[PDB]
Design a binder for this molecule. Structure first.
Ligand SMILES: CCCCCCCCO[C@@H]1O[C@H](CO)[C@@H](O)[C@H](O)[C@H]1O
Ligand SMILES: CCCCCCCCO[C@@H]1O[C@H](CO)[C@@H](O)[C@H](O)[C@H]1O
Ligand SMILES: CCCCCCCCO[C@@H]1O[C@H](CO)[C@@H](O)[C@H](O)[C@H]1O
Ligand SMILES: CCCCCCCCO[C@@H]1O[C@H](CO)[C@@H](O)[C@H](O)[C@H]1O
Length: 262
């Protein structure tokens, strides 16, 4: 069953749509691979690597993100016990001198209880209500090991060409690798997307209003085809990646993309 219409940008609703080939996966966040050029390649934190001394400022940045509906209807129609896998990787590709190393990769899996919904906010519609467990770590080992865990809620609301997604979280478990991570990441994430025809303009960021630290990411995409987009990104601030969670930097990159926030 499950009524909720396609609704562009709606993760859960889309997850509720059933496919035939069980190997057809659903997207969660955005999927892209872009060539970037950072302003500061934090080698101080990756000092332990025997190529840090040769870290280049131009890296290949890609993000993979899929959703796996584990059990539709677990809480009534248009609901799903789901999981996702989002992976962001910074790859010193051009630095062949050092044999093209990966400077960092953050793996964050999610197990969540999601709902496709229909709530009128004066023009807007609260489309996704989702809350679940999050884990984010960089798979490294000391001293460059970074990781934390969060319980969270994801809300998605759209109003025509506009889309707003807020994601407040509460930290759980261990945070020794990066004890003060909240000083840099704050207590939530905000996504704003805007549709100008087929052009999609977007913003994703976090800011700890107390410590005044934060980070932002602005982006613009356009169709190259039915499935692939040309994507430009400008990230700036702390938190781009776990290894640089307490490192500030401005990164501009250009590449291709599959899906945008909507
Ligand atoms: C496709 C290349 O795979 C990459 O291999 C790297 C090797 O360490 C990993 O760190 C990255 O996470 C992985 O995406
Ligand atoms: C905070 C937990 C999220 C509540 C989401 C549960 C999904 C229930 O579903 C909601 O039921 C409402 C009826 O009251 C309808 O008006 C909404 O359109 C529908 O999405
Ligand atoms: C040690 C890692 C155990 C991961 O387990 C997590 O623990 C959380 C604690 O609040 C629970 O809320 C999550 O449902 C559970 O997945
Ligand atoms: C940040 C994105 C700014 C979106 O701004 C919008 O641009 C539209 C196109 O010109 C106008 O028609 C709308 O009035 C305006 O709100």
């Amino acid at each position: 069953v499950h009524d909720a219409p396609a609704v562009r940008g709606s993760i859960i609703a889309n997850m509720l749509q059933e496919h035939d080939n069980p190997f057809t996966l659903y997207p969660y966040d955005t999927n892209y691979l872009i060539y970037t050029q950072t302003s500061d390649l934090n080698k101080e934190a990756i000092a332990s690597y025997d190529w840090a001394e040769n870290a280049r400022k131009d890296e290949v940045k890609f993000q993979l993100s899929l959703a796996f509906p584990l059990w539709r209807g677990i809480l009534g129609p248009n609901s799903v016990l789901g999981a996702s896998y989002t992976q962001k990787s910074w790859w010193q590709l051009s630095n062949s001198e050092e044999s093209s190393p990966f400077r960092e990769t953050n793996y964050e899996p999610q197990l969540f209880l999601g709902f496709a919904t229909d709530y009128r906010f004066a023009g807007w519609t609260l489309r996704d209500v989702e809350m679940g467990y999050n884990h984010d770590s960089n798979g490294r080992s000391d001293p460059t090991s970074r990781s934390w865990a969060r319980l969270y809620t994801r809300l998605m609301a759209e109003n025509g060409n506009w889309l707003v997604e807020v994601k407040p979280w509460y930290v759980v478990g261990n945070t020794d690798d990066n004890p003060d991570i909240t000083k840099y990441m704050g207590y939530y994430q905000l996504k704003i997307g805007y549709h100008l025809g087929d052009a999609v303009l977007s913003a994703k960021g976090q800011y700890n209003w107390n410590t005044g630290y934060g980070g932002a990411e602005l982006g613009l995409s356009y169709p190259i085809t039915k499935h692939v987009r040309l994507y430009t990104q400008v990230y700036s601030g702390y938190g781009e990646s776990l290894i640089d969670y307490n490192f500030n930097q401005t990164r501009v990159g250009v590449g291709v993309m599959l899906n945008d926030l909507f």
